[PDB]
Amino acid sequence: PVFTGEKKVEETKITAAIYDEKSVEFKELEVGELESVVRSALALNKKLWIDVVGVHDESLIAKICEFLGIHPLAAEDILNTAQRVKIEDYDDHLFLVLKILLYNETLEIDQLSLVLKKNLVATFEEREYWILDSIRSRLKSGGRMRKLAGDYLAYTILDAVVDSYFEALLKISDEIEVLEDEVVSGDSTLIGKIHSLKREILAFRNAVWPLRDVLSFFTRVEHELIGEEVKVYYRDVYDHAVRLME
Amino acid sequence: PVFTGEKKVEETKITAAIYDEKSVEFKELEVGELESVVRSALALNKKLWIDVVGVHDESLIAKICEFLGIHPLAAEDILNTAQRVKIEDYDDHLFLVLKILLYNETLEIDQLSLVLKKNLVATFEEREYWILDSIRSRLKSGGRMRKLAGDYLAYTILDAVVDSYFEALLKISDEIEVLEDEVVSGDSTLIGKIHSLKREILAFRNAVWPLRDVLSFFTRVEHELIGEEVKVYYRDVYDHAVRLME
Ligand SMILES: [Co+2]
Ligand SMILES: [Co+2]
C-alpha cells in the first residue's frame, strides 16, 4: 500500500449517506473513522454511499478497503493517482478508476476511484468542492435516487463526470482556435499545413477511438461465434489497441 | 440499399477461400458471381472466407447479404462508406465496420466491413492491394489458420488492421514534430503555448479515451450488481460518451 503524488493540503475526511426508499429519510452521519464504519454502518437493510475525500494516507484507506472488502489490488490502484482509466470485476465489487478535469487556472487532472458492491457505493476523491454537490442535492430531494440501488447511484456519478468532459472539450477547442489564429494571423499564412494535419489527426481519432470499444466486445461478451479458446487472441489485439493511445 | 462516396475506378470482384484443417488443402475459387455462391459454396463441412473487393454496386451486395443471411440494416451500413467504427450482434452473425488508413500521398481513409457467422467470414473492401496479402499467405502455409474456426480468422484481420494503426500514428507524430518546429523555429519562439495546449489535449485523451471502453462494460456484461432496469441509464451515458469524440 504505497502512495505517490501529493494533492490535498488537508487531512482525510470520510462521510457516509444512508437512504431508505422514497421515504423522506437521508441519514448522513460524517462520523466514520475506521471503527465507526466496520461495525456501526452494517444494518444490511439500508442504502449506503461511503465518500472518502483524502487519498494521501496509505494506512487509512488500506484498512478502509479491508473494512469494505475491496480487494488489495484495487486498493493500491486507489493510491496510485496516476493510474489509467479502467474497470475491474472483483466480482462482489466493481472497481473503476476515473479522471476529473479541473480548470483551476492551468488544467489540473484529479483521480476519482469508484467501487460498487451489492447495495454499496464507495467513492474515493482527491479533493472536495466536486460535481458531487448535486449528487447530495438529488439525495436531498425525494426522487428516483433513493428508490433505486447502488447501481443507479454509480451511474449518476458517471453521468456527472462525463458531463464535465464536454466542458473541457469546449475550452480546449477555443484554445486551439486561439493558437491556430495567432499562428496563421501571425503573418505566416503560408501555413495551410495546419489543416492538412488537423484532418490527419481527426481521421485517426475516428478510426482508432471507437476501436478499443469494438475489440472489447469479443473480450467480455458470451457469444456462440467466438470459441472459449480464441479469447486469448482477441484480448491481445485489445491490449495492442490499448497501448496505441497510451 | 443506397451507396455514397465513389472510390474504386474498377468493378466488383468476389473471391472465396476454402480450408479444411491442417490438411494441405486451401481451395480458393474466384468463381463467385451471385448464383455461384448461394448454391455452389454450401458444403456445410468446410471453412469459408468470402472476400468482396468492390462496394459501389448497391445491387450486387444487397443480394450478397441476402445470400449470406446478413441483416438488411448491416447491408446499408456496408454501403455507407462514411459509417462510424462499430460492432453489432445479429445474432447469427457479428457485424463490424472498421477503417483503414492509407498514406497514398495524402492520407486516405477506406472502409472495411467484416461479418462473422458460424464458421463463415465475410469481408467487404473498398480497394485491393490491402494488408490481407499475408492473410492469404498464412492460409497458404499449413498453420493454425486452417485448423481454427472463422473466429480466429476474424481475429487475424483485426490484428493486421490494428498493426497498421501504429504506422499512421508514427507518421502523424513526425508531422507534428515537423510543423511544431517550423512554427517555433519560425522565429516565433515566444510560443511555449504549444506545449501548454499539447498537455491539455493529451490529458483529455488519457481521461476520455479509455472511457467509452469503461462505460460499455455495464452495457453488455451480465452482472449481479447492475440490475436489468438500470441498464437504460448506463447505455445513455455511453451514448453521451460516444458523442464526445464524434
Ligand atoms: Co500481442
Ligand atoms: Co442522455
B20-40 as b/e, with b when 16 or more CB fall inside 10 Å?
A: eeeeeebeeeeebeeeebeee
Nearest to A86 among B93, B210, B237 (CB): B210
Rounded CA separation A2/A93 (Å): 22
The SS3 assignment for B46 reads coil
Breaks (C-N over 2.5 A) in chain A follow: none
C-alpha cell at B14: 468476389
Chain B residues whose beta carbon lies within 8 Å of the beta carbon of residue A107: 199-200, 203
Which of A103, A143, A94, A212 is closest to B203 using CA atoms?
A: A103
A27-56 as b/e, with b when 16 or more CB fall inside 10 Å?
A: eeeeebeeeebeeebeeeeebbbbbbbbbb
Size of interface A-B (CB pairs under 8 A): 215
HEC secondary structure over B141-154: CCCHHHHCCHHHHH
Tell if the CB–CB gap between A196 and B106 is shorter than 8 Å.
yes
Ligand nearest to the CA of B235: 2
| Angle, helix B150-184 to helix A211-220, in steps of 10 degrees | 150
| Chain B, nearest residue to A221 by Cα | B221
| Experimentally determined by | X-ray
Rounded CA separation A94/A111 (Å): 17
Order the strands of the B47-52 sheet from edge to edge.
Answer: B26-27, B15-19, B47-52, B120-125, B106-117, B93-104, B86-89
| Angle, helix A231-244 to helix B150-184, in steps of 10 degrees | 10
Whether A91 contacts B226, CB under 8 Å: no
Q: Provide the shortest C-alpha distance from residue B111 to chain A (in Å).
A: 10
How many of the other CB atoms lie within 10 Å of CB of A166? Answer: 12
Rounded CA separation B136/B17 (Å): 9
Distance of CA B65 to the CA centre of its chain: 17
For A143-246, CATH number? 1.20.58.340
Domain borders along chain A are: 1-142, 143-246
Kindly give the distance from the C-alpha atom of residue B169 to the centroid of ligand 1, in angstroms, as a whole number.
Answer: 18
Which of B217, B165, B45 is closest to A209 using CA atoms?
A: B165
DSSP chain A: ---B----SS----EEEEE-SSSS-EE------SHHHHSTT--TTSEEEEEE-----HHHHHHHHHTTT--HHHHHHHHBTTPPSEEEE-SSEEEEEEEEEEEESEEEEEEEEEEEETTEEEEEESSSS-STHHHHHHHHSSSHHHHS-HHHHHHHHHHHHHHHHHHHHHHHHHHHHHHHHHHHTTT-----HHHHHHHHHHHHHHHHTTHHHHHHHHHH---TTS-TTTHHHHHHHHHHHHHHT-
Tell if the CB–CB gap between B99 and A186 is shorter than 8 Å.
no
Whether B114 contacts B96, CB under 8 Å: yes
Q: Do the domains A1-142 and A143-246 sit in the same CATH topology, yes or no?
A: no
Whether B50 contacts B37, CB under 8 Å: yes
Rounded CA separation B72/B62 (Å): 8
DSSP B186: T
The SS3 assignment for B231 reads helix
The SS3 assignment for B73 reads helix
Whether B109 contacts A203, CB under 8 Å: yes
Tell if the CB–CB gap between A148 and B210 is shorter than 8 Å.
no
The architecture (CATH level 2) of B1-142 comes to: 2-Layer Sandwich (3.30)
DSSP A113-160: EEEEETTEEEEEESSSS-STHHHHHHHHSSSHHHHS-HHHHHHHHHHH
Whether A230 contacts B158, CB under 8 Å: no
Rounded CA separation B216/B162 (Å): 20
- List the resolution, Å: 2.9
**C-alpha distance from residue B203 to each of A84, A161, A187, B1 (Å):** 11, 15, 30, 42
How many of the other CB atoms lie within 10 Å of CB of A139? Answer: 20
Asked if the peptide bond before residue A91 counts as cis, ω within 30 degrees of 0, the response is: yes
CB-based contacts of B164: which residues, under 8 Å, 6+ apart? Answer: B100, B101, B131
Which of B159, B22, B170 is closest to A211 using CA atoms?
A: B159
End-to-end CA distance of chain A: 25
The SS3 assignment for B224 reads coil
Chain A residues whose beta carbon lies within 8 Å of the beta carbon of residue B166: 244
Whether A143 contacts B165, CB under 8 Å: no
- The C-alpha R_g of chain A, in whole angstroms, comes to 22
Per the DSSP assignment, residues forming a β-bridge with B17 are B49
Q: β-pairing, A120-125 with A47-52?
A: parallel
CB-based contacts of B43: which residues, under 8 Å, 6+ apart? Answer: none
**C-alpha distance from residue A77 to each of A56, A62, A98, A150, B4 (Å):** 13, 11, 11, 22, 48
Phi and psi torsions of B119, nearest 5°: 50, 55
**C-alpha distance from residue A177 to each of A38, A157, A196, B73, B191 (Å):** 52, 31, 15, 39, 15
Burial of B4 (0-12, 13-18, 19+ CB in 10 A): exposed
Which of A217, A212, A227 is closest to B89 using CA atoms?
A: A217
E strand or H helix at B137, and its extent? helix B133-140
The SS3 assignment for B170 reads helix
